[PDB]
Design an enzyme around this catalytic site. Structure first.
Site, PDB file in Angstrom:
ATOM      1  N   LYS A   4       0.810  -1.206   0.000  1.00 15.33           N
ATOM      2  CA  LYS A   4       0.000   0.000   0.000  1.00 15.33           C
ATOM      3  C   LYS A   4       0.864   1.287   0.000  1.00 15.33           C
ATOM      4  O   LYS A   4       2.106   1.232   0.157  1.00 15.33           O
ATOM      5  CB  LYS A   4      -0.980  -0.043   1.183  1.00 15.33           C
ATOM      6  CG  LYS A   4      -2.008  -1.174   1.091  1.00 15.33           C
ATOM      7  CD  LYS A   4      -3.086  -1.036   2.154  1.00 15.33           C
ATOM      8  CE  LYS A   4      -3.928  -2.288   2.271  1.00 15.33           C
ATOM      9  NZ  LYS A   4      -4.887  -2.228   3.418  1.00 15.33           N
TER      10      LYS A   4
ATOM     11  N   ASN B 178      -2.027  -0.213   6.947  1.00 15.85           N
ATOM     12  CA  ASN B 178      -1.481  -1.483   7.394  1.00 15.85           C
ATOM     13  C   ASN B 178      -0.567  -2.180   6.387  1.00 15.85           C
ATOM     14  O   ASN B 178      -0.569  -3.412   6.293  1.00 15.85           O
ATOM     15  CB  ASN B 178      -2.602  -2.412   7.881  1.00 15.85           C
ATOM     16  CG  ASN B 178      -3.605  -2.740   6.803  1.00 15.85           C
ATOM     17  OD1 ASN B 178      -3.481  -2.320   5.656  1.00 15.85           O
ATOM     18  ND2 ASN B 178      -4.610  -3.513   7.172  1.00 15.85           N
TER      19      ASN B 178
ATOM     20  N   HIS C 201      -1.992  -5.235   1.277  1.00 12.89           N
ATOM     21  CA  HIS C 201      -3.248  -5.930   1.023  1.00 12.89           C
ATOM     22  C   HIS C 201      -2.948  -7.326   0.546  1.00 12.89           C
ATOM     23  O   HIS C 201      -2.047  -7.540  -0.276  1.00 12.89           O
ATOM     24  CB  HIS C 201      -4.078  -5.205  -0.043  1.00 12.89           C
ATOM     25  CG  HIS C 201      -5.250  -6.024  -0.562  1.00 12.89           C
ATOM     26  ND1 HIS C 201      -6.495  -5.932  -0.038  1.00 12.89           N
ATOM     27  CD2 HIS C 201      -5.322  -6.992  -1.562  1.00 12.89           C
ATOM     28  CE1 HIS C 201      -7.319  -6.789  -0.675  1.00 12.89           C
ATOM     29  NE2 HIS C 201      -6.608  -7.435  -1.605  1.00 12.89           N
TER      30      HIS C 201
ATOM     31  N   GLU D 256      -9.693 -10.192  -8.004  1.00 11.62           N
ATOM     32  CA  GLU D 256      -8.696  -9.118  -7.839  1.00 11.62           C
ATOM     33  C   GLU D 256      -7.567  -9.167  -8.865  1.00 11.62           C
ATOM     34  O   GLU D 256      -7.232  -8.157  -9.467  1.00 11.62           O
ATOM     35  CB  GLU D 256      -8.110  -9.116  -6.409  1.00 11.62           C
ATOM     36  CG  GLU D 256      -8.976  -8.399  -5.383  1.00 11.62           C
ATOM     37  CD  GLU D 256      -8.615  -8.722  -3.938  1.00 11.62           C
ATOM     38  OE1 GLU D 256      -7.435  -9.036  -3.668  1.00 11.62           O
ATOM     39  OE2 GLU D 256      -9.519  -8.647  -3.064  1.00 11.62           O
TER      40      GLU D 256
ATOM     41  N   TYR E  53     -11.887  -1.616  -4.559  1.00 13.84           N
ATOM     42  CA  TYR E  53     -12.799  -1.499  -3.430  1.00 13.84           C
ATOM     43  C   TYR E  53     -14.204  -1.199  -3.923  1.00 13.84           C
ATOM     44  O   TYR E  53     -14.525  -0.057  -4.253  1.00 13.84           O
ATOM     45  CB  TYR E  53     -12.332  -0.404  -2.473  1.00 13.84           C
ATOM     46  CG  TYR E  53     -11.052  -0.733  -1.747  1.00 13.84           C
ATOM     47  CD1 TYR E  53     -10.984  -1.818  -0.865  1.00 13.84           C
ATOM     48  CD2 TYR E  53      -9.916   0.051  -1.921  1.00 13.84           C
ATOM     49  CE1 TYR E  53      -9.821  -2.118  -0.189  1.00 13.84           C
ATOM     50  CE2 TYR E  53      -8.740  -0.235  -1.243  1.00 13.84           C
ATOM     51  CZ  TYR E  53      -8.699  -1.316  -0.381  1.00 13.84           C
ATOM     52  OH  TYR E  53      -7.532  -1.602   0.285  1.00 13.84           O
TER      53      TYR E  53
END
Lengths: 169, 168, 166, 169, 168, 169
Positions: free
Chosen positions: C10, C128, C131, C142, C50
């Site tokens: 990320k 975080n 992914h 994905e 998303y």
């Protein structure tokens, strides 16, 4: 096949052993692609220390005092001894260990990263330099040193998974 | 600043097949250089022949040397990425270490991860397997980058430590 | 039992210089990288990864928006990882979604630490580091969004026989 | 000497050796303060394998097929065997290794960091689990296993420099 | 935000004498926690008795445990520092791992750097040597911090990655 | 007490601090065997910076511009200052830190591993070189520098557990 393939004797010295550096040392050799083909851990007795560090040679090149100090360092102390095989491995192992004197040993090398004291200090105190590791200095040395530490049937023959990247297949 | 450079690096098929991609990338991120492009691909013969130019290599080396370069990378996985920073071409050359793994100084990518010799590679008829390629100089970086990356695949963003390397 | 799973470093991972560290964790256990690219995510692409209808149902519009704002117009490093039951294994190496709770040893546990309570209070998404696809279906969905079929590589790692057996 | 002082038998299995993980493995043990008191590298012949994996133990705990798999995996393949000494070292070693099955082994353990595949896949394929390392399951196993790999004279008595921090002085 | 906390940490004498200061500090820097104070000192008996309060330790454990703690750190070198972060107290507890090194999970400071047990420590009459101390909770951090540091020894500054942890 | 035992002042500069590099830096010194004997973290005020970087000292060796940029880099910024003890430590620390200029600093060293930018770029931007660390250049600088950062009772006397490998016993 090729004459350039060599074996070299390595000893993690007592300083190295007592400081818990055997793994750190071995990783360095495994990481570049050199292959461990023999290993033993032992307490070195006087007799064996005297075969490894030859009076006649050490006295010829340095002094009786240097020899005494080598013998006292290694005798009745623990070592981790191993053989590393590879393309021109004697030279490469010398490269990875760094200069004999830890003070001068370059950062990135085993001696440079894990030790620091100077010959001048060790001579003042009357001790051998504690520089973590011994490696056969050249081809004749390795040919002499290996059989002193290992029987022929303790030298292993096998393939590392990355063999084709180092020897070609 | 004219001092800002981009250089092309390739984790070669040997570094890929050995699982060294991460190890190589970290070396560059750790000194403060920025990754501004990346992709993974199987290199076809035709792309190989553009990266390694016949006329250039032959002149500086020989046909056997070119051929073995093409054989090594062709139909093989590579990880190609671009690095940006102050005088990055030189810095990257320094981090990789000498072309010949036997001679690469410990501390360098090639010194820490490879060891074999030109002498051995010449005897067996293979290229040296030395983990990584980096552009040798500026003209080479300008020629090589567009070969691997379209202009819209070069990223512009700020590393959080940018003020320590470029200043703010 | 062989699977591919989609991973993304990320923008917090990218801006902190952690791409290498993350990749190493996967290569080290024996997992094989079979696709990689780095890019700036535009809103268009962010909204495909998303899904509004999915996230709103499962959380809320606020959460979805924060996710979108996190990645839109920011750098990511995306790659595909292959191996035996890799999806679950990758999940295991990443650690809990919430860095505060993630166990040391895991990517999230070692490289980040802030909490959901904190992110809710500031109105930001959790940062975080990485992914990873949650399960089989999410990965099948994905991967095609980030990679074309011809960008997915077939090759042998030198340690393959230790993992797939030969 | 406290009865809590234990020696345990570790083996870097052929998968770990072929992958160049010996150093990485040893370091994990040296790093927590455990002490290496014996080491050797060897090609394991079938009879040594059958001493280490006892027919009656393995067929009781598992099956004949699993025994054959265990034997097929280590026979005529290199291993690095060593003995680790410390306070309650058998338990500690087992914690350091993590779950038998790498797929389940928690990140941070040897098996968690260096392998990932499962029994389901091991069974499907007809091979033993390739899980990097063996460590003695308990006191009785350690007592049986050590003399299999090492003679008494190959177990070393020395003091690590950090001894005082682990054993007290 | 009331979620932002400071916690007191100490590399204990076992960690200092073993050369583990750097190793410990890095674990905290790596996750994003910020070092806001640091000092090295020989702990005198009196300061030891302020950090480990007789009344607390004797009530929960025993006089023998207290004596042992005081003997472990008194007239011995320590590296004390203060860490700041979002719920740092909890996060530091997690990174240290269980009080008993034998049980400490690999990946933690105590799990990676130490291993012996309470059973042994109790048999030998010594304190557990578990590398590091960290404040157990908010009350303890509020108590312990001013015992080791003066207000002006606590630093206000931005880590370069601030925006990834605190947001901006 | 051999006259070769030396103390040297080190400083993780604001760039190293803001980058979270304190741990990595201290480790490089601990790992070779050098001993940490003092440490504090502080915001450097203008006054302290001028004591550490002396106008006359820096002007005659470089210039006024350089001194200004040194003052501006360090003033009102966090540093982590510490003292290293060991055999001929001043030279050793300088070896470990690498060349003043990160661009030239050799891999394996603190500066070569963690920074890279150049004197040409820093001169062109008007700033100091950001090179992670300061180490005392020589015995005399060390003697002058230490008491500026540390009071006598802030320098600690204790034994590292590996002392005998470095100092002998």
């Amino acid at each position: 096949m090729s004459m350039l393939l060599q074996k070299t004797l390595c000893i993690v010295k007592p300083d190295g052993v007592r400081r818990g550096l055997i793994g750190d040392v071995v990783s360095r050799f495994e990481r570049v692609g050199l292959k461990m083909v023999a290993a033993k851990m032992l307490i070195v007795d006087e007799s064996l220390a005297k075969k490894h560090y030859l009076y006649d040679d050490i006295v010829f090149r340095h002094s009786e005092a240097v020899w005494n100090s080598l013998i006292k360092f290694i005798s009745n102390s623990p070592v981790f001894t191993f053989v590393v095989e590879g393309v021109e491995s004697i030279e490469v192992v010398r490269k990875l260990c760094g200069a004999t004197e830890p003070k001068l040993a370059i950062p990135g090398t085993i001696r440079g990263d894990f030790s620091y004291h100077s010959f001048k200090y060790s001579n003042e105190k009357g001790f051998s330099i504690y520089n973590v590791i011994h490696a056969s200095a050249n081809e004749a040395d390795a040919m002499r040193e290996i059989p002193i530490w290992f029987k022929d049937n303790e030298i292993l023959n096998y393939k590392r998974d990355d063999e084709c990247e180092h020897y070609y297949c």
